[PDB]
Short mmCIF file of all heavy atoms in Angstrom, two decimals:
data_model
loop_
_atom_site.label_atom_id
_atom_site.label_comp_id
_atom_site.label_asym_id
_atom_site.label_seq_id
_atom_site.Cartn_x
_atom_site.Cartn_y
_atom_site.Cartn_z
N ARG B 13 -13.41 -5.42 -8.75
CA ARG B 13 -13.77 -5.20 -10.15
C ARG B 13 -13.23 -6.28 -11.07
O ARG B 13 -13.95 -6.79 -11.94
CB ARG B 13 -13.23 -3.85 -10.62
CG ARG B 13 -14.20 -2.72 -10.51
CD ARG B 13 -13.99 -1.72 -11.62
NE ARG B 13 -15.30 -1.26 -12.05
CZ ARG B 13 -16.01 -0.36 -11.39
NH1 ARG B 13 -15.55 0.18 -10.28
NH2 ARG B 13 -17.21 -0.01 -11.84
N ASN B 44 22.16 -20.44 0.99
CA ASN B 44 22.82 -20.84 2.23
C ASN B 44 23.83 -19.81 2.73
O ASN B 44 24.32 -19.95 3.86
CB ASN B 44 23.51 -22.20 2.06
CG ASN B 44 24.54 -22.19 0.95
OD1 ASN B 44 24.59 -21.27 0.13
ND2 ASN B 44 25.36 -23.23 0.91
N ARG B 53 11.34 -12.02 -3.42
CA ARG B 53 10.64 -13.18 -2.88
C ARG B 53 10.43 -12.98 -1.38
O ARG B 53 11.19 -12.27 -0.73
CB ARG B 53 11.44 -14.47 -3.10
CG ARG B 53 11.69 -14.82 -4.55
CD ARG B 53 10.42 -15.20 -5.23
NE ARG B 53 10.33 -16.65 -5.34
CZ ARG B 53 10.51 -17.34 -6.45
NH1 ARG B 53 10.77 -16.71 -7.60
NH2 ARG B 53 10.41 -18.66 -6.43
N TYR B 83 -6.72 -29.48 -2.98
CA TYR B 83 -5.96 -28.27 -3.28
C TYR B 83 -4.52 -28.44 -2.81
O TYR B 83 -4.28 -28.84 -1.67
CB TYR B 83 -6.64 -27.07 -2.61
CG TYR B 83 -5.98 -25.72 -2.85
CD1 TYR B 83 -6.50 -24.83 -3.78
CD2 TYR B 83 -4.87 -25.33 -2.13
CE1 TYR B 83 -5.91 -23.60 -3.99
CE2 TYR B 83 -4.27 -24.10 -2.33
CZ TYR B 83 -4.79 -23.24 -3.26
OH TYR B 83 -4.18 -22.01 -3.44
N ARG B 87 1.87 -25.90 -6.12
CA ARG B 87 1.90 -26.11 -7.57
C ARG B 87 0.58 -25.60 -8.13
O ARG B 87 -0.38 -25.37 -7.40
CB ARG B 87 2.11 -27.58 -7.92
CG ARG B 87 1.10 -28.51 -7.21
CD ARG B 87 1.44 -29.98 -7.36
NE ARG B 87 2.88 -30.20 -7.34
CZ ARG B 87 3.58 -30.44 -6.24
NH1 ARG B 87 2.96 -30.50 -5.06
NH2 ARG B 87 4.89 -30.62 -6.30
N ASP B 98 -3.00 -51.94 -1.79
CA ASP B 98 -1.94 -52.20 -0.82
C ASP B 98 -2.29 -51.72 0.58
O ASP B 98 -1.81 -52.28 1.56
CB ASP B 98 -0.66 -51.49 -1.28
CG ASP B 98 0.38 -52.44 -1.78
OD1 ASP B 98 0.17 -53.66 -1.67
OD2 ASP B 98 1.42 -51.96 -2.27
N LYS B 153 9.47 -35.13 -14.94
CA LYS B 153 10.10 -33.82 -15.10
C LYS B 153 9.29 -32.85 -15.95
O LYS B 153 9.27 -31.66 -15.65
CB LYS B 153 11.49 -33.98 -15.74
CG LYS B 153 12.69 -33.85 -14.77
CD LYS B 153 12.46 -34.58 -13.45
CE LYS B 153 13.76 -34.73 -12.64
NZ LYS B 153 14.51 -33.43 -12.48
N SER B 178 6.08 -26.48 -24.57
CA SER B 178 6.64 -25.31 -25.23
C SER B 178 6.64 -25.42 -26.75
O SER B 178 6.97 -24.43 -27.41
CB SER B 178 8.06 -25.04 -24.73
OG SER B 178 8.96 -26.08 -25.08
N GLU B 180 8.64 -27.45 -28.38
CA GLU B 180 9.88 -28.11 -28.75
C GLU B 180 9.61 -29.58 -29.06
O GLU B 180 8.83 -30.24 -28.37
CB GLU B 180 10.89 -27.96 -27.62
CG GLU B 180 12.03 -28.97 -27.64
CD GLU B 180 12.99 -28.75 -26.49
OE1 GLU B 180 13.37 -27.59 -26.25
OE2 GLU B 180 13.36 -29.74 -25.82
N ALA B 223 14.66 1.20 -14.94
CA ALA B 223 14.52 2.61 -15.29
C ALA B 223 14.09 3.46 -14.10
O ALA B 223 13.99 4.68 -14.23
CB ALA B 223 13.51 2.78 -16.45
N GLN B 252 22.35 -8.46 -22.13
CA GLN B 252 21.23 -8.05 -22.96
C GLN B 252 20.05 -8.99 -22.78
O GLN B 252 20.21 -10.19 -22.53
CB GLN B 252 21.66 -7.98 -24.42
CG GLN B 252 22.68 -6.86 -24.68
CD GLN B 252 23.04 -6.70 -26.14
OE1 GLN B 252 22.23 -6.97 -27.02
NE2 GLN B 252 24.26 -6.26 -26.39
N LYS B 257 20.46 -15.14 -26.87
CA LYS B 257 20.22 -16.53 -26.51
C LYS B 257 21.16 -16.96 -25.40
O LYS B 257 22.29 -16.47 -25.27
CB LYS B 257 20.39 -17.46 -27.71
CG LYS B 257 19.15 -17.58 -28.58
CD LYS B 257 19.33 -18.66 -29.64
CE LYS B 257 18.20 -18.64 -30.65
NZ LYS B 257 18.36 -19.69 -31.68
N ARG B 259 20.96 -20.62 -23.80
CA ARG B 259 21.31 -22.04 -23.68
C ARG B 259 22.79 -22.23 -23.95
O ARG B 259 23.37 -21.61 -24.84
CB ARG B 259 20.49 -22.91 -24.65
CG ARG B 259 21.14 -24.30 -24.91
CD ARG B 259 20.34 -25.26 -25.80
NE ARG B 259 19.63 -26.23 -24.98
CZ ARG B 259 19.92 -27.52 -24.86
NH1 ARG B 259 20.91 -28.07 -25.55
NH2 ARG B 259 19.19 -28.27 -24.06
P G D 249 -6.30 -47.08 10.68
OP1 G D 249 -7.14 -45.85 10.65
OP2 G D 249 -6.94 -48.35 11.08
"O5'" G D 249 -5.66 -47.25 9.24
"C5'" G D 249 -5.02 -46.15 8.61
"C4'" G D 249 -4.60 -46.53 7.22
"O4'" G D 249 -3.53 -47.51 7.30
"C3'" G D 249 -5.67 -47.22 6.39
"O3'" G D 249 -6.57 -46.31 5.79
"C2'" G D 249 -4.84 -48.02 5.40
"O2'" G D 249 -4.35 -47.15 4.38
"C1'" G D 249 -3.67 -48.46 6.27
N9 G D 249 -3.93 -49.78 6.90
C8 G D 249 -4.37 -49.97 8.19
N7 G D 249 -4.52 -51.22 8.50
C5 G D 249 -4.14 -51.90 7.36
C6 G D 249 -4.10 -53.30 7.12
O6 G D 249 -4.39 -54.20 7.90
N1 G D 249 -3.67 -53.59 5.83
C2 G D 249 -3.32 -52.64 4.89
N2 G D 249 -2.93 -53.11 3.70
N3 G D 249 -3.36 -51.33 5.12
C4 G D 249 -3.77 -51.03 6.36
P A D 313 -1.97 -20.67 -0.61
OP1 A D 313 -0.51 -20.61 -0.33
OP2 A D 313 -2.40 -21.08 -1.97
"O5'" A D 313 -2.62 -21.62 0.50
"C5'" A D 313 -2.37 -21.40 1.90
"C4'" A D 313 -2.99 -22.47 2.77
"O4'" A D 313 -4.43 -22.48 2.55
"C3'" A D 313 -2.53 -23.89 2.50
"O3'" A D 313 -2.79 -24.66 3.67
"C2'" A D 313 -3.52 -24.32 1.43
"O2'" A D 313 -3.60 -25.71 1.23
"C1'" A D 313 -4.81 -23.72 1.98
N9 A D 313 -5.83 -23.44 0.97
C8 A D 313 -5.88 -22.34 0.15
N7 A D 313 -6.90 -22.34 -0.67
C5 A D 313 -7.58 -23.51 -0.34
C6 A D 313 -8.76 -24.08 -0.84
N6 A D 313 -9.50 -23.54 -1.82
N1 A D 313 -9.16 -25.25 -0.30
C2 A D 313 -8.42 -25.80 0.68
N3 A D 313 -7.30 -25.35 1.24
C4 A D 313 -6.93 -24.19 0.67
P U D 439 -20.19 3.28 -17.77
OP1 U D 439 -19.21 3.13 -18.88
OP2 U D 439 -21.60 3.64 -18.08
"O5'" U D 439 -20.22 1.95 -16.89
"C5'" U D 439 -19.64 0.73 -17.36
"C4'" U D 439 -19.01 -0.06 -16.24
"O4'" U D 439 -17.59 0.27 -16.16
"C3'" U D 439 -19.57 0.20 -14.84
"O3'" U D 439 -19.39 -0.97 -14.04
"C2'" U D 439 -18.64 1.29 -14.32
"O2'" U D 439 -18.59 1.41 -12.91
"C1'" U D 439 -17.30 0.84 -14.90
N1 U D 439 -16.35 1.93 -15.12
C2 U D 439 -15.05 1.71 -14.72
O2 U D 439 -14.70 0.68 -14.17
N3 U D 439 -14.18 2.74 -14.98
C4 U D 439 -14.47 3.93 -15.59
O4 U D 439 -13.58 4.76 -15.75
C5 U D 439 -15.84 4.08 -15.99
C6 U D 439 -16.71 3.09 -15.75
P G D 529 16.67 -24.68 -22.61
OP1 G D 529 17.97 -25.38 -22.76
OP2 G D 529 16.01 -24.10 -23.80
"O5'" G D 529 15.60 -25.67 -21.98
"C5'" G D 529 15.90 -26.41 -20.80
"C4'" G D 529 15.47 -27.85 -20.93
"O4'" G D 529 14.02 -27.91 -20.86
"C3'" G D 529 15.88 -28.57 -22.22
"O3'" G D 529 16.26 -29.91 -21.92
"C2'" G D 529 14.58 -28.58 -23.03
"O2'" G D 529 14.48 -29.65 -23.94
"C1'" G D 529 13.54 -28.69 -21.93
N9 G D 529 12.21 -28.22 -22.30
C8 G D 529 11.82 -27.69 -23.51
N7 G D 529 10.55 -27.38 -23.53
C5 G D 529 10.07 -27.74 -22.29
C6 G D 529 8.76 -27.64 -21.74
O6 G D 529 7.71 -27.20 -22.26
N1 G D 529 8.74 -28.12 -20.44
C2 G D 529 9.81 -28.63 -19.75
N2 G D 529 9.54 -29.03 -18.51
N3 G D 529 11.03 -28.73 -20.25
C4 G D 529 11.09 -28.26 -21.52
P C D 530 17.74 -30.24 -21.39
OP1 C D 530 18.68 -29.26 -21.96
OP2 C D 530 18.03 -31.68 -21.57
"O5'" C D 530 17.65 -29.95 -19.84
"C5'" C D 530 16.81 -30.72 -18.99
"C4'" C D 530 17.02 -30.34 -17.55
"O4'" C D 530 16.49 -29.01 -17.34
"C3'" C D 530 16.33 -31.25 -16.53
"O3'" C D 530 17.16 -31.39 -15.39
"C2'" C D 530 15.07 -30.46 -16.16
"O2'" C D 530 14.58 -30.73 -14.86
"C1'" C D 530 15.57 -29.02 -16.27
N1 C D 530 14.51 -28.03 -16.53
C2 C D 530 14.13 -27.20 -15.48
O2 C D 530 14.71 -27.33 -14.40
N3 C D 530 13.15 -26.27 -15.64
C4 C D 530 12.55 -26.17 -16.82
N4 C D 530 11.59 -25.24 -16.94
C5 C D 530 12.90 -27.01 -17.92
C6 C D 530 13.88 -27.92 -17.74
P A D 542 23.59 -28.70 -1.70
OP1 A D 542 23.01 -29.90 -1.06
OP2 A D 542 23.59 -28.51 -3.18
"O5'" A D 542 22.85 -27.43 -1.10
"C5'" A D 542 22.31 -26.47 -1.98
"C4'" A D 542 22.30 -25.09 -1.38
"O4'" A D 542 23.54 -24.41 -1.72
"C3'" A D 542 21.21 -24.22 -1.95
"O3'" A D 542 19.99 -24.38 -1.25
"C2'" A D 542 21.81 -22.82 -1.93
"O2'" A D 542 21.71 -22.23 -0.64
"C1'" A D 542 23.27 -23.13 -2.23
N9 A D 542 23.51 -23.19 -3.68
C8 A D 542 23.85 -24.31 -4.39
N7 A D 542 23.97 -24.10 -5.67
C5 A D 542 23.69 -22.75 -5.81
C6 A D 542 23.65 -21.91 -6.93
N6 A D 542 23.91 -22.33 -8.18
N1 A D 542 23.33 -20.62 -6.72
C2 A D 542 23.07 -20.21 -5.48
N3 A D 542 23.07 -20.91 -4.35
C4 A D 542 23.40 -22.18 -4.59
P A D 545 10.95 -21.23 -8.16
OP1 A D 545 11.14 -22.19 -9.29
OP2 A D 545 9.75 -20.39 -8.08
"O5'" A D 545 11.02 -22.04 -6.80
"C5'" A D 545 9.96 -22.91 -6.42
"C4'" A D 545 10.50 -24.20 -5.87
"O4'" A D 545 11.10 -24.96 -6.96
"C3'" A D 545 11.59 -24.05 -4.81
"O3'" A D 545 11.47 -25.10 -3.86
"C2'" A D 545 12.87 -24.23 -5.61
"O2'" A D 545 13.99 -24.65 -4.87
"C1'" A D 545 12.44 -25.28 -6.64
N9 A D 545 13.23 -25.26 -7.87
C8 A D 545 13.10 -24.39 -8.91
N7 A D 545 13.94 -24.60 -9.89
C5 A D 545 14.68 -25.68 -9.46
C6 A D 545 15.74 -26.39 -10.07
N6 A D 545 16.24 -26.09 -11.27
N1 A D 545 16.27 -27.43 -9.38
C2 A D 545 15.75 -27.72 -8.18
N3 A D 545 14.76 -27.13 -7.52
C4 A D 545 14.25 -26.11 -8.22
P G D 547 8.24 -30.05 -6.53
OP1 G D 547 7.23 -30.91 -5.86
OP2 G D 547 9.29 -30.65 -7.39
"O5'" G D 547 7.45 -29.10 -7.52
"C5'" G D 547 6.78 -27.92 -7.08
"C4'" G D 547 7.10 -26.75 -7.97
"O4'" G D 547 8.47 -26.33 -7.75
"C3'" G D 547 7.04 -27.01 -9.47
"O3'" G D 547 5.73 -26.93 -10.00
"C2'" G D 547 7.97 -25.95 -10.04
"O2'" G D 547 7.32 -24.70 -10.09
"C1'" G D 547 9.05 -25.90 -8.97
N9 G D 547 10.20 -26.77 -9.27
C8 G D 547 10.67 -27.79 -8.47
N7 G D 547 11.71 -28.40 -8.97
C5 G D 547 11.97 -27.74 -10.16
C6 G D 547 12.99 -27.96 -11.14
O6 G D 547 13.90 -28.78 -11.18
N1 G D 547 12.87 -27.06 -12.19
C2 G D 547 11.92 -26.09 -12.30
N2 G D 547 12.01 -25.34 -13.41
N3 G D 547 10.97 -25.87 -11.41
C4 G D 547 11.05 -26.73 -10.36
P U D 548 5.31 -27.86 -11.24
OP1 U D 548 4.02 -27.37 -11.79
OP2 U D 548 5.45 -29.28 -10.84
"O5'" U D 548 6.45 -27.61 -12.33
"C5'" U D 548 6.49 -26.39 -13.07
"C4'" U D 548 7.24 -26.54 -14.36
"O4'" U D 548 8.63 -26.88 -14.09
"C3'" U D 548 6.71 -27.63 -15.30
"O3'" U D 548 6.83 -27.19 -16.64
"C2'" U D 548 7.69 -28.77 -15.09
"O2'" U D 548 7.80 -29.63 -16.19
"C1'" U D 548 8.99 -28.02 -14.84
N1 U D 548 9.96 -28.82 -14.08
C2 U D 548 11.10 -29.24 -14.74
O2 U D 548 11.35 -28.93 -15.89
N3 U D 548 11.94 -30.02 -13.99
C4 U D 548 11.75 -30.44 -12.69
O4 U D 548 12.60 -31.15 -12.14
C5 U D 548 10.54 -29.97 -12.09
C6 U D 548 9.70 -29.20 -12.79
P G D 556 13.32 -1.75 -17.05
OP1 G D 556 14.21 -0.62 -16.72
OP2 G D 556 12.72 -2.54 -15.95
"O5'" G D 556 12.13 -1.22 -17.98
"C5'" G D 556 12.41 -0.39 -19.10
"C4'" G D 556 11.28 -0.36 -20.10
"O4'" G D 556 10.92 -1.71 -20.51
"C3'" G D 556 9.96 0.23 -19.63
"O3'" G D 556 9.96 1.64 -19.61
"C2'" G D 556 8.98 -0.36 -20.63
"O2'" G D 556 9.09 0.28 -21.89
"C1'" G D 556 9.53 -1.77 -20.77
N9 G D 556 8.91 -2.70 -19.81
C8 G D 556 9.40 -3.12 -18.59
N7 G D 556 8.58 -3.94 -17.96
C5 G D 556 7.49 -4.06 -18.81
C6 G D 556 6.29 -4.80 -18.67
O6 G D 556 5.94 -5.53 -17.75
N1 G D 556 5.44 -4.64 -19.76
C2 G D 556 5.72 -3.85 -20.86
N2 G D 556 4.79 -3.79 -21.82
N3 G D 556 6.84 -3.14 -21.00
C4 G D 556 7.67 -3.30 -19.95
P G D 572 26.69 -3.90 -33.40
OP1 G D 572 27.96 -4.42 -32.83
OP2 G D 572 26.27 -4.28 -34.76
"O5'" G D 572 25.48 -4.31 -32.45
"C5'" G D 572 25.55 -4.20 -31.04
"C4'" G D 572 24.20 -4.44 -30.41
"O4'" G D 572 23.22 -3.60 -31.05
"C3'" G D 572 23.63 -5.85 -30.54
"O3'" G D 572 24.13 -6.74 -29.55
"C2'" G D 572 22.13 -5.62 -30.44
"O2'" G D 572 21.72 -5.49 -29.09
"C1'" G D 572 21.97 -4.25 -31.10
N9 G D 572 21.53 -4.35 -32.51
C8 G D 572 22.25 -4.04 -33.63
N7 G D 572 21.58 -4.24 -34.73
C5 G D 572 20.35 -4.71 -34.31
C6 G D 572 19.21 -5.11 -35.06
O6 G D 572 19.04 -5.13 -36.28
N1 G D 572 18.18 -5.53 -34.23
C2 G D 572 18.23 -5.56 -32.86
N2 G D 572 17.12 -6.00 -32.25
N3 G D 572 19.28 -5.19 -32.15
C4 G D 572 20.30 -4.79 -32.94
P G D 575 20.86 -17.82 -33.46
OP1 G D 575 20.65 -19.15 -32.82
OP2 G D 575 22.16 -17.15 -33.24
"O5'" G D 575 20.57 -17.98 -35.02
"C5'" G D 575 19.34 -18.54 -35.47
"C4'" G D 575 19.16 -18.43 -36.97
"O4'" G D 575 18.97 -17.05 -37.38
"C3'" G D 575 20.31 -18.90 -37.83
"O3'" G D 575 20.38 -20.31 -37.95
"C2'" G D 575 20.04 -18.21 -39.15
"O2'" G D 575 19.00 -18.86 -39.85
"C1'" G D 575 19.52 -16.86 -38.67
N9 G D 575 20.61 -15.87 -38.57
C8 G D 575 21.20 -15.37 -37.44
N7 G D 575 22.15 -14.51 -37.69
C5 G D 575 22.18 -14.43 -39.08
C6 G D 575 23.00 -13.65 -39.94
O6 G D 575 23.89 -12.85 -39.66
N1 G D 575 22.70 -13.89 -41.27
C2 G D 575 21.74 -14.75 -41.72
N2 G D 575 21.62 -14.82 -43.05
N3 G D 575 20.96 -15.48 -40.94
C4 G D 575 21.24 -15.27 -39.63
#
Side-chain angles (χ1 to χ4, degrees):
Chain B
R13 265 213 141 78
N44 59 346
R53 299 291 259 254
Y83 181 101
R87 52 190 36 90
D98 251 355
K153 257 43 167 50
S178 65
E180 160 180 314
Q252 293 184 30
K257 276 188 189 180
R259 160 176 260 251

